[PDB]
């Protein structure tokens, strides 16, 4: 309606937080990321659809309700936040 507020990723494989400031990934669980975060990383418009090309990204996890940087290699792409 108004526009894309952000994008959603989804963890495919379970990996425990290596560091307290690391974000945990569980299979099937969704991670919510805003446009501001991706733009702060310097992502090209149409690159976010390939998270492994961006690397570690700051977002919100559903199962843990925690916030931090997750390795965007074990995650799939869901779509834009509208």
UniProtKB/Swiss-Prot annotation:
Q: How is it modified after translation?
A: Phosphorylated in response to signaling from activated receptor-type protein kinases. Dephosphorylated by PTPRJ. Ubiquitinated. Polyubiquitination by the SCF(FBXL2) complex probably promotes proteasomal degradation of PIK3R2.
SH3 domain location, by residue?
Answer: 4-80
Lineage, top-rank taxon, reads: Eukaryota
User: Which residues are listed as membrane-spanning?
Assistant: none
- Record's family? Belongs to the PI3K p85 subunit family.
Query: What is said about the domains?
Result: The SH2 2 domain is required for interaction with FBXL2 and PTPN13.
Q: What does this protein do?
A: Regulatory subunit of phosphoinositide-3-kinase (PI3K), a kinase that phosphorylates PtdIns(4,5)P2 (Phosphatidylinositol 4,5-bisphosphate) to generate phosphatidylinositol 3,4,5-trisphosphate (PIP3). PIP3 plays a key role by recruiting PH domain-containing proteins to the membrane, including AKT1 and PDPK1, activating signaling cascades involved in cell growth, survival, proliferation, motility and morphology.
Q: Name the disease.
A: Megalencephaly-polymicrogyria-polydactyly-hydrocephalus syndrome 1: A syndrome characterized by megalencephaly, hydrocephalus, and polymicrogyria; polydactyly may also be seen. There is considerable phenotypic similarity between this disorder and the megalencephaly-capillary malformation syndrome.
How does this chain assemble?
Heterodimer of a regulatory subunit PIK3R2 and a p110 catalytic subunit (PIK3CA, PIK3CB or PIK3CD). Interacts with AXL. Interacts with FLT1 (tyrosine-phosphorylated) and FLT4 (tyrosine-phosphorylated). Interacts with NYAP1, NYAP2 and MYO16. Interacts with FBXL2; PIK3R2 is a substrate of the SCF(FBXL2) complex. Interacts with PTPN13; dephosphorylates PIK3R2. Interacts with XBP1 isoform 2; the interaction is direct and induces translocation of XBP1 isoform 2 into the nucleus in a ER stress- and/or insulin-dependent but PI3K-independent manner.
Write down what this protein is called.
Phosphatidylinositol 3-kinase regulatory subunit beta
Q: What is the lineage of its organism?
A: Eukaryota, Metazoa, Chordata, Craniata, Vertebrata
**Which residues of the whole protein are included?**
1 to 80 of 728
């Amino acid at each position: 309606m108004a526009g894309p507020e952000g994008f959603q990723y989804r963890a495919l494989y379970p990996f425990r937080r290596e560091r307290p400031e690391d974000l945990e990934l569980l299979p099937g669980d969704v991670l919510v990321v805003s446009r501001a975060a991706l733009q702060a990383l310097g992502v090209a418009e149409g690159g976010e659809r390939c998270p492994q090309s961006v690397g570690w990204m700051p977002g919100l996890n559903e199962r843990t309700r925690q916030r931090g940087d997750f390795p965007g290699t074990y995650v799939e792409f869901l779509g834009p936040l509208e």
